[PDB]
Amino acid sequence: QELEGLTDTTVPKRLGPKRANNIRKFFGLSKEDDVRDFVIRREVTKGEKTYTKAPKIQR
Amino acid sequence: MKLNISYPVNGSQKTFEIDDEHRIRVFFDKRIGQEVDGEAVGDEFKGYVFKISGGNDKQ
Amino acid sequence: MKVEIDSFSGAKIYPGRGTLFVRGDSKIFRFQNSKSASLFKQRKNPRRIAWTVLFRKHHKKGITEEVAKKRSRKTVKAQRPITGASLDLIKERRSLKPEVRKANREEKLKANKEKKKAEKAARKAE
RNA sequence: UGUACAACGGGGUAUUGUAAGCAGUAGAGUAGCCUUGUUGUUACGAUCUGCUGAGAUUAAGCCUUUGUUGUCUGAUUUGU
RNA sequence: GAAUGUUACCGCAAUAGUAAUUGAACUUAGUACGAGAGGAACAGUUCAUUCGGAUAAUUGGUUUUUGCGGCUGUCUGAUCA
RNA sequence: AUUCAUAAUAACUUUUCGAAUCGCAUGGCCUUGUGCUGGCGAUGGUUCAUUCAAAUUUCUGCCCUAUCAACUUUCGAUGGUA
RNA sequence: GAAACUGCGAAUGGCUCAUUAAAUCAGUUAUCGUUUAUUUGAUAGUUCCUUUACUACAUGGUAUAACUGUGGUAAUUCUAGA
């Protein structure tokens, strides 16, 4: 059986990688695969305007 | 008592009140780290297997 | 009626059987019998006495309860909604690992834009 | 001459507190051997562990007993 | 414990003796009464005191169970016992 | 004044340090590759010296009392050796 | 630019004067008998370990907070799980 508050429902991870290689294998890409382009952004909406808040990369 | 439980897979977590002393004697005299089957405590938890992570007692 | 253990010896103490001893440190002890109690008055060691449960324990006799805490073998295999990922888009990006030629093309276009910018820099300086 | 009795035994139950013997890379340390050690070994060594809740005892006023072994016709006395 | 026919089993009761006693707590009741200060009673419940008669599950005591184990001294060649 | 400062061989070390850090700037050489080079700083790092100190420590000095004249040394009192 | 981590400081300062009579303390000395974060000045070409494939060196890996939401406590600058 599937329990609703736990099993049927699911939830997000609030964040993803901030590290180069973390990204790199979070998608299993390469030594070269433009991790910048494989970035995850978060979009929010201050007003009419929105923006993607791409964090950073370290190392 | 009550049971706060989590499903890492979905990543969810919910609390459940419980009575039936003779559902919870299943749990009685057990460690934090052991596993028990759930229809013993609620047929809603049939086939499921919980594990324990600790808790917070009276006082 | 409740059933207890011998503060010395480790036995179930059925009602009105055995005795109790108290100690001005508020502490309580129970005894099945005068034997254990007398050892107590003799301020003795229930871990050097043999026939106690405590000794059968601290010397590991009849220890048939605890077996092993197993260490599992399992992977993640739970692609979570990363909160900026769009799990369909997540699988799309996970499968788009090849075709680094698009990356190379963007990089050459950026080489061109950077050359143009440095040229504009030298010109604005001059 | 029998769900008879008895002694032995067996089991249970209760009490002690882990038997003698055998082993041990345990052992405070010590002397000796040479193959010298590459834990070198031989030997002295209270004690410690394992075989061991072990062995020992248990009715003499405890229970039981499908076992074993036997026992069961002596004496006297009494009458409306 | 002889004798009453024997012997056995069940049994009546002349008689004689006799034994239970005492207090507190709660309620009543801060009531009755009284100016007030103060301050009750029977019923009822729970416990106890003294005495008595029985028992000994458990607690405790007692141990020649010389049952178990332990210690010294000495004898058994040693050990074992 | 030193067995010193330092050096030097043999070895040792559960192996220490020897920069995966960051801002600002953007420059120069070209065989134009995101090629090679390059500055002003900020941090942190082994050791030596320094400095802010610290620890010990030398000599000399302190009130009333003898109705306290002997004291310390068991278990450190003194010294020596390891 | 909140919160948290990390780095630091929190041993200063301040107050008071109980104890303490060669003990603090003054003044004087030594550290050839030592510690020194720190400021300050100088200071690491050798370190790829069968160091000819072992290889990331345009640079390596794992946690974990803050946060998410789930909870206990009568209560504390309590806290757990996920």
Swiss-Prot record, chain B:
Superkingdom, taxonomy of origin: Eukaryota
Localisation per UniProt entry: Cytoplasm; Nucleus, Nucleolus
Note: Present with 66000 molecules/cell in log phase SD medium.
Family of the protein in this entry: Belongs to the eukaryotic ribosomal protein eS6 family.
Function statement: Component of the ribosome, a large ribonucleoprotein complex responsible for the synthesis of proteins in the cell. The small ribosomal subunit (SSU) binds messenger RNAs (mRNAs) and translates the encoded message by selecting cognate aminoacyl-transfer RNA (tRNA) molecules. The large subunit (LSU) contains the ribosomal catalytic site termed the peptidyl transferase center (PTC), which catalyzes the formation of peptide bonds, thereby polymerizing the amino acids delivered by tRNAs into a polypeptide chain.
Quaternary structure (record): Component of the small ribosomal subunit (SSU). Mature yeast ribosomes consist of a small (40S) and a large (60S) subunit. The 40S small subunit contains 1 molecule of ribosomal RNA (18S rRNA) and 33 different proteins (encoded by 57 genes). The large 60S subunit contains 3 rRNA molecules (25S, 5.8S and 5S rRNA) and 46 different proteins (encoded by 81 genes). Interacts with snoRNA U3. uS11 interacts with MPP10. Component of the ribosomal small subunit (SSU) processome composed of at least 40 protein subunits and snoRNA U3.
Record protein name field: Small ribosomal subunit protein eS6A
Range covered out of full length: 1 to 59 of 236
Swiss-Prot record, chain C:
Name of protein: Large ribosomal subunit protein eL24A
Annotated compartments: Cytoplasm
Family listed: Belongs to the eukaryotic ribosomal protein eL24 family.
Basic and acidic residues compositional bias, start-end: 89-126
Highest taxon of source: Eukaryota
GO molecular function, one term: mRNA binding
Keywords: Cytoplasm, Phosphoprotein, Ribonucleoprotein, Ribosomal protein
Organism this protein belongs to: Saccharomyces cerevisiae (strain ATCC 204508 / S288c)
Presence of the UniProt keyword Membrane in the record: no
GO cellular component, as recorded: cytosol; cytosolic large ribosomal subunit
Phosphoserine PTM positions: 7
Function: Component of the ribosome, a large ribonucleoprotein complex responsible for the synthesis of proteins in the cell. The small ribosomal subunit (SSU) binds messenger RNAs (mRNAs) and translates the encoded message by selecting cognate aminoacyl-transfer RNA (tRNA) molecules. The large subunit (LSU) contains the ribosomal catalytic site termed the peptidyl transferase center (PTC), which catalyzes the formation of peptide bonds, thereby polymerizing the amino acids delivered by tRNAs into a polypeptide chain.
Major subcellular location class: cytoplasm
GO biological process terms, semicolon-separated: cytoplasmic translation; translational elongation; translational initiation
Assembly description: Component of the large ribosomal subunit (LSU). Mature yeast ribosomes consist of a small (40S) and a large (60S) subunit. The 40S small subunit contains 1 molecule of ribosomal RNA (18S rRNA) and 33 different proteins (encoded by 57 genes). The large 60S subunit contains 3 rRNA molecules (25S, 5.8S and 5S rRNA) and 46 different proteins (encoded by 81 genes).
Note: Present with 247000 molecules/cell in log phase SD medium. There are 2 genes for eL24 in yeast.
Complete-protein stretch covered: 1 to 126 of 155
Segments for region (Disordered): 66-126
